[PDB]
Amino acid sequence: IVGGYTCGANTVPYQVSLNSGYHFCGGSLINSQWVVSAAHCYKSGIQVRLGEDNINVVEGNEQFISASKSIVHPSYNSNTLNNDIMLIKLKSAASLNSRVASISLPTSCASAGTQCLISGWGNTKSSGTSYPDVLKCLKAPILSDSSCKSAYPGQITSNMFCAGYLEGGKDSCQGDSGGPVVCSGKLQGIVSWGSGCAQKNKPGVYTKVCNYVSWIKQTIASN
Numbered sequence: 001i002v003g004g005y006t007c008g009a010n011t012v013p014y015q016v017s018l019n020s021g022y023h024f025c026g027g028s029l030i031n032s033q034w035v036v037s038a039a040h041c042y043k044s045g046i047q048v049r050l051g052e053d054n055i056n057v058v059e060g061n062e063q064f065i066s067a068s069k070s071i072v073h074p075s076y077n078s079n080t081l082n083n084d085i086m087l088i089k090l091k092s093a094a095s096l097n098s099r100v101a102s103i104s105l106p107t108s109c110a111s112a113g114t115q116c117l118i119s120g121w122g123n124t125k126s127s128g129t130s131y132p133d134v135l136k137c138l139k140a141p142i143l144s145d146s147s148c149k150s151a152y153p154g155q156i157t158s159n160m161f162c163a164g165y166l167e168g169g170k171d172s173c174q175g176d177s178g179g180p181v182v183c184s185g186k187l188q189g190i191v192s193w194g195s196g197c198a199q200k201n202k203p204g205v206y207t208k209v210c211n212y213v214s215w216i217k218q219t220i221a222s223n
């Protein structure tokens with residue numbers, strides 16, 4: 001997260017870290033057995049880390065649970081990142097508490113101008129590299145589809161939206177992928193892609209979760 005702030009420990013209790021020997025992506029807990037992330041975060045051997053603040057220190061509220069299965073969206077296109085969403089099932093259910101909590105799925109799509117909370121352990125610099133140990137947060141509005149498509153001609157589908165600031169300085173970044181965009185208490189986005197980080201006229205691009213609720217619910221009910 002570039003241009004954000006330190007969330008505070010466990011203040012984003014649905015935020016998970018995906019670990020394969022190291023943190024490599026975020027995700028969101030949607031019930032005690034299932035996490036939503038980005039398809040471009042797919043790999044085998046994922047351990048889901050819940051209750052994290054400092055990802056380099058055991059602080060006492062963590063749960064580390066291996067994934068038993070991962071399901072990439074059937075229509076995911078790795079060239080274009082269309083349908084950049086996957087589901088991860090936990091081998092054992094998480095123990096839900098104030099610091100390990102699920103986030104609700106949308107009942108409809110959110111409007112442009114709605115303010116959202118984006119979070120992750122990704123790079124905090126727009127030129128160069130610095131990774132935080134603790135979770136970072138950014139408040140950012142959903143941008144109009146026209147400003148999104150103007151920034152990325154030919155690349156935006158109906159399964160994507162932009163959020164952030166056209167003036168630059170505030171954005172998600174490498175290592176935030178797969179993590180949440182929450183608006184009005186609902187998981188509306190997944191950190192997906194962008195051009196650089198926090199650059200002018202290049203807002204972040206997010207998977208549009210409201211298009212996937214039926215797929216999510218049916219997939220988890222059958223797996």
Ligand SMILES: NC(=[NH2+])N1CCCCC1
Pocket residue numbers: 171172173174175176177191192193194195196197198203204205
């Ligand atoms: N929002 C961005 N600029 N991103 C998304 C996360 C990966 C790097 C590009």
Ligand SMILES: [Ca+2]
Pocket residue numbers: 052053054055056057058059062
């Ligand atoms: Ca920790």
